[PDB]
Amino acid sequence: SHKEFTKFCYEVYNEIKISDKEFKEKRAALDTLRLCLKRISPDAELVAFGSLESGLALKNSDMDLCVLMDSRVQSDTIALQFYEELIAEGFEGKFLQRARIPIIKLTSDTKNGFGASFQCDIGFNNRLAIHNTLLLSSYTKLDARLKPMVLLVKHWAKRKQINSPYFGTLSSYGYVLMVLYYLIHVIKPPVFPNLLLSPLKQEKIVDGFDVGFDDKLEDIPPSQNYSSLGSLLHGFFRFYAYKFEPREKVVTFRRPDGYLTKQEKGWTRYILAIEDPFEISHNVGRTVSSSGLYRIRGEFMAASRLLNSRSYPIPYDSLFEEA
Ligand SMILES: Nc1ccn([C@@H]2O[C@H](COP(=O)(O)OP(=O)(O)OP(=O)(O)O)[C@@H](O)[C@H]2O)c(=O)n1
Numbered sequence: 001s002h003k004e005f006t007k008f009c010y011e012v013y014n015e016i017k018i019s020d021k022e023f024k025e026k027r028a029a030l031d032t033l034r035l036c037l038k039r040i041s042p043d044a045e046l047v048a049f050g051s052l053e054s055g056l057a058l059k060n061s062d063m064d065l066c067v068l069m070d071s072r073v074q075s076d077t078i079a080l081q082f083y084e085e086l087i088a089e090g091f092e093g094k095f096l097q098r099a100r101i102p103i104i105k106l107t108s109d110t111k112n113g114f115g116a117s118f119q120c121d122i123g124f125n126n127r128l129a130i131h132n133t134l135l136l137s138s139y140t141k142l143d144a145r146l147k148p149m150v151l152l153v154k155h156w157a158k159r160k161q162i163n164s165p166y167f168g169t170l171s172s173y174g175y176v177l178m179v180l181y182y183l184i185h186v187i188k189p190p191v192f193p194n195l196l197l198s199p200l201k202q203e204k205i206v207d208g209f210d211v212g213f214d215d216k217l218e219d220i221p222p223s224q225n226y227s228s229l230g231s232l233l234h235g236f237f238r239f240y241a242y243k244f245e246p247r248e249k250v251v252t253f254r255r256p257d258g259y260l261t262k263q264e265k266g267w268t269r270y271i272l273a274i275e276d277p278f279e280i281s282h283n284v285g286r287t288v289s290s291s292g293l294y295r296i297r298g299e300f301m302a303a304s305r306l307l308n309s310r311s312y313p314i315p316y317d318s319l320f321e322e323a
């Protein structure tokens, strides 16, 4: 059935999704940040990416931003100038640089009214992340079930302590890709086509990678999968609990049948292997340790068992209880 579980899923979704109120405050914050950038470099553009842009944001979301500028202009000089303007304007945070890549990490706002724990990461010419976000935004527009499904999975992973890339588990973006892989290449009939492998896809090279995909969404036929949100979630938990083979296989968006071995990739960390759809050299699961994968799989299994339980009433709330 999944009727009661679906009802429960939509109720949780409405409580965890970013409110219209917080969203418009994040937009106001972006406008302020843009004004500060204007004063420093009139040619540069400040753009948002990640879950606020794709519509996949939970409450109390962080902001992910990228400064776009002339590639002939070295990013560190403008980065520092931007950072110093932000301090003068009452933001708090850090200026840092890993290798050649400068980053600003804002952690507070003391004047502009966006909060004592206003969090905002600023990159410089991170064009790949913009493209990744365009892909996720396109899928989110293609089927209305994706948004609530992703938010629920993200909320679950947080509650189960398996959403900690610094402590041996998986990033939120990694969970999003696991969702999409399931909806494109596992479920039958598929919820989504693979937009990268479309015969209408046009090559577009950005920083050496092909970020092309079919984005003419209005011409794409609606899904022939009629499953409820509840049923989609249960199949998702089941696939990664019992069917997916993390020791051998790679989550991939580059194969018509979604089949790819770690050996073909030379990805023999590679404990969990998730090939970023555009930056194919990047394993999104590289943060996942052996013990971390054990807990991830354990939680997939526990979720599957809960939804398959014949002991009624099923305590659906325990899906989002802290492990
Ligand atoms: N390996 C990664 C991870 C991050 N990003 C980009 O950075 C964004 C933010 O990543 P993440 O922190 O994992 O998502 P959040 O929305 O910030 O997490 P949450 O919604 O749970 O708060 C992603 O959408 C993605 O575009 C990326 O390009 N490649």
Ligand SMILES: [Mg+2]
Binding pocket: 049, 050, 051, 052, 062, 063, 064
């Ligand atoms: Mg984000």
